[PDB]
Amino acid sequence: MDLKVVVSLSSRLYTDEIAKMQQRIGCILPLASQNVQGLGLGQVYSLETVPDYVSMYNYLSDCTLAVLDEVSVDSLILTKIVPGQTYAIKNKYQPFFQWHGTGSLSVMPPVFGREHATVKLESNDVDIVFPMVLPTPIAEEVLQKILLFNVYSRVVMQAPGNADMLDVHMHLGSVSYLGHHYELALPEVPGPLGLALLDNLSLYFCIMVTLLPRASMRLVRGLIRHEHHDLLNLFQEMVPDEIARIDLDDLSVADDLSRMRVMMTYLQSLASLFNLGPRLATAAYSQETLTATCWLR
Amino acid sequence: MDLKVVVSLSSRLYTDEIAKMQQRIGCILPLAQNVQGLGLGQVYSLETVPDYVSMYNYLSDCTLAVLDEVSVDSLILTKIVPGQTYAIKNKYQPFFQWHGTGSLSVMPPVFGREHATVKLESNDVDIVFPMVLPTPIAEEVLQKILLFNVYSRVVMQAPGNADMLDVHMHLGSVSYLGHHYELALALLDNLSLYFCIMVTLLPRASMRLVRGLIRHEHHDLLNLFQEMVPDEIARIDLDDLSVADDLSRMRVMMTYLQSLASLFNLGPRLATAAYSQETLTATCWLR
Amino acid sequence: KVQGSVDRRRLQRRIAGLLPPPARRLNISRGSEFTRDVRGLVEEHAQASSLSAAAVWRAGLLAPWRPPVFGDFLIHASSFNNAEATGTPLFQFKQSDPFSGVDAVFTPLSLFILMNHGRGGGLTRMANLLYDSPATLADLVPDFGRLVADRRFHNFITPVGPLVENIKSTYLNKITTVVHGPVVSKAIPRSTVKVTVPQEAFVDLDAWLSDARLYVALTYEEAGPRFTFFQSSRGHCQIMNILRIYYSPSIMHRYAVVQPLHIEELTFGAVACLGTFSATDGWRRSAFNYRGSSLPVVEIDSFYSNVSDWEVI
Amino acid sequence: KIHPGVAMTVVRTDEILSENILFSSRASTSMFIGTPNVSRREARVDAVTF
Amino acid sequence: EYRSTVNPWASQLGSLGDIMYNSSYRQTAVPGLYSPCRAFFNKEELLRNNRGLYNMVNEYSQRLLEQPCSFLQEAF
């Protein structure tokens, strides 16, 4: 099991960059397989294209990751992520995320600005942007928020009375966190592969909308007729037309089994579409030195 | 490498504690060492309600462990690496099956709280082992308990719609690989509620997403074929609602669909290779 | 006469330093040969557990070559054919009857003749030539047409990785398959192993795109199913999307004519990952010949079969 | 076989497998020869490779 | 040598004893229950046991298991 994988450069890494590269030791970097381009995320996230956060997410999820351990001049070494090994990762990322509960860590592209996780390489004509590491639920809500903006920018633009384009830019806004709110970067056009992901998600959504369990409709109608639950607060004591008109029929035992069976297989397929990108299960994160020991989950 | 973990018990133990570790040596428990927080003993404390999503997110939070030995004060146990294979038995209060199932599940025991909770009067640690069961058994019993508690709460709202005999004829009898098993009976209530709000928010969210992605590919074979199928009764009532309430609906919808997708995925996913009937053991590795 | 860049003595002592320790013999023959082994054992535990330099020296001296798990099955020697190759990925169909002393597995030629019996090139004649009757495998499986009507054929087929050890008997042939870990030879000595996949049921996903994982793919074609095997070095979690795109030109094109009822038939195929072979070694095409004729076959060396679950497309 | 009214310059690449001649002066570079160290790779059950 | 068949209601390819116990019409049955004449009326079990007896006798001629009593497909 080899880990010490050097990446040979071709020019002199000057001392203006050696300082900030030694500043970023213990972070995570994605691999190509070395050559000076394609080792990082600047090969797929350039300034020429829109920051789409899906094609670079595809490059993060397709190819493996690596810890940066030492940066010499003219060459730097990398340490791979093979499973079964406990890797120690420092939190060296400018939007800070405190790992109190020590959940499963999760890689992300720099959706909180290119400028915090970039490094300027003037040795060779290449720029390297670091992936963002953060726990799983914040990562999943970043995914859902960036796809919601990528599907809703077009339909807010599509209205002729676009009196509120800035409504979603604050409504989505920051990320949802208690101790501090962290604003992110929002692209106007979702690009090709983001739209392919929404296309597959729309495929799955319209297939599962062909089978709805009618039994929960009776329970939510009863909870409307009963006291207003705090989880029901999104309805504000209103029965919409759709839930009022999907309940003209009866409730039986025949449809429910096949409904919930195909809902089991399609929700497992949706988890497989949301098990997206490589994740790191975390045990024994020592806060006093900020090292989260992880094996490849 | 010794993957074994040592836990010192607080006080001295006695006879049926040895009998119940001999009963539960083969079965397994999660992890956080500290003798209070060994497994699910901080969720099954009765001063709070034993909930399913908190226990499930704890079980997915912490690792897993194989209990191996209990002396007068020690708790010899090993944990789970993804690397090498360990030996697993059933030793479970439902004694279900092992017929060559290549995919396993580890769920907290919905069949009985006290069926897997072992209690000591000298040591209040009330430790408990979540039920390991194969994946078709797992999905069949989770369906047949979720729809059962849905029907129970619906009868509690209005008993005139749903009955109990025709649902006990079908939704109480799991059947897998020739074997016909029987099971009947808060945590499933709230789990059902999350599904209840997800399946009632799925109509508006589904028509909004297919109305956003309906004419992206301006003449697609696949997009038109997924548009020809679904409900004509569904795709009418969207444009009436305000913006912020709509996006809050979609946001809560996406959070709980990701939660219920990861929850319908079977959590700790073990995998067996060769099961021996006469010893009641199989070899397993983490997957 | 001159000096090399390497001295042989330094490399020799470096290899002697980095050498693993010998495995501990224990002669049960003579007591004089037994007391030296038990004295070596107690001295080994003493110098491996006492708090001195000996403990850390022996701890650094240890290398961690773990043996993989093996699946021993009993199959009918008439329902199998021992003339097929060794490294064939077997598929144990789940038998619901508990009153069955044996089990049933499937080479790709056997399930190929099952799919052809449920409804080609040279491989269909090769599979008819190897397995002479599809009726044997047809009534071997209890419910074939019903389980393909409800489309749950995929979770009833559990892949058990490649075949390595296969004895030949009259009744009740015994086979041995590696399930998890590296493929290796167990009874026959642990030298080398290959994985034989039929080339006509094995397509490269990345060549269609134009580590190295291997994916088994069931598809439910609208006249009757088919297995295909997919090799791709792409993501473990980004294999569903590309294969959805790959099966996209077929699905509605043959799904316009069919419409389901009593609801089933929405699941169009399911896919598991058989495991990973190394990116260093590629797959080398060869020829698989029965006594009638030959067939092209793909050899995959150095596999690490880690069978995942079937995932619906 | 009529003329299309447009002439075409047709470019083409060509690879020539030449065999070259390298000349270098005396004492041009100064090689520094290291001394080799061994390692341990993925030790399989049949061979422990270095 | 004289009587081709004593029981015409189970010995034909599609007769009564065949169509309820052979696996070609036993699709909608529960597999957990045991049926003792499945060892007698499965066509594949009969061809399998006969070919096994044939190659066992032929193999011992060429030289120079769960149950022995099910070799002879007869009951007592």
From Swiss-Prot, chain B:
Major place of residence: virion
Superkingdom, natural source: Viruses
Name by which UniProt lists this protein: Triplex capsid protein 2
Pfam families for this protein: Herpes_V23
Gene Ontology terms for molecular function: structural molecule activity
Function: Structural component of the T=16 icosahedral capsid. The capsid is composed of pentamers and hexamers of major capsid protein/MCP, which are linked together by heterotrimers called triplexes. These triplexes are formed by a single molecule of triplex protein 1/TRX1 and two copies of triplex protein 2/TRX2. Additionally, TRX1 is required for efficient transport of TRX2 to the nucleus, which is the site of capsid assembly.
Alphabetical list of InterPro entries matching this protein: Herpes_capsid_2
Subunit structure: Interacts with TRX1 and major capisd protein/MCP.
Compartments where found: Virion; Host nucleus
Disulfide bonds: none
Protein source organism: Epstein-Barr virus (strain B95-8)
Gene assigned in the entry: TRX2
Keyword annotations from UniProtKB, A to Z: Capsid protein, Host nucleus, Virion
GO terms under cellular component: host cell nucleus; viral capsid
Recorded family membership: Belongs to the herpesviridae TRX2 protein family.
From Swiss-Prot, chain C:
InterPro entries referenced in this protein's UniProt entry, alphabetically: Herpes_1
Predominant location: virion
Places the protein is found: Virion; Host nucleus
Keywords assigned: Capsid protein, Host nucleus, Virion
Name of this chain's protein: Triplex capsid protein 1
GO molecular function term, any single one: DNA binding
Quaternary state and interactors: Interacts with TRX2, MCP and capsid vertex component 2/CVC2.
GO biological process, one term: viral capsid assembly
Entry-linked Pfam families: Herpes_VP19C
Lineage top rank: taxon: Viruses
Function description: Structural component of the T=16 icosahedral capsid. The capsid is composed of pentamers and hexamers of major capsid protein/MCP, which are linked together by heterotrimers called triplexes. These triplexes are formed by a single molecule of triplex protein 1/TRX1 and two copies of triplex protein 2/TRX2. Additionally, TRX1 is required for efficient transport of TRX2 to the nucleus, which is the site of capsid assembly.
Signal peptide: none
Disulphide-bonded residues: none
Protein family per UniProt: Belongs to the herpesviridae TRX1 protein family.
Any single GO CC term annotated in Swiss-Prot or TrEMBL for this entry: host cell nucleus
Annotated source species: Epstein-Barr virus (strain B95-8) (HHV-4)
Coiled-coil annotated spans: none
From Swiss-Prot, chain E:
Similarity-based family: Belongs to the herpesviridae major capsid protein family.
Protein name: Major capsid protein
Function: Self-assembles to form an icosahedral capsid with a T=16 symmetry, about 200 nm in diameter, and consisting of 150 hexons and 12 pentons (total of 162 capsomers). Hexons form the edges and faces of the capsid and are each composed of six MCP molecules. In contrast, one penton is found at each of the 12 vertices. Eleven of the pentons are MCP pentamers, while the last vertex is occupied by the portal complex.
Gene this chain is encoded by: MCP
Domain of life of the native organism: Viruses
Quaternary state and interactors: Homomultimer. Makes the hexons and eleven out of twelve pentons. Interacts with triplex proteins 1/TRX1 and 2/TRX2; adjacent capsomers are linked together in groups of three by triplexes, heterotrimeric complexes composed of one molecule of TRX1 and two molecules of TRX2. Interacts with scaffold protein; this interaction allows efficient MCP transport to the host nucleus. Interacts with capsid vertex component 2/CVC2. Interacts with the small capsomere-interacting protein/SCP.
Localization annotation: Virion; Host nucleus
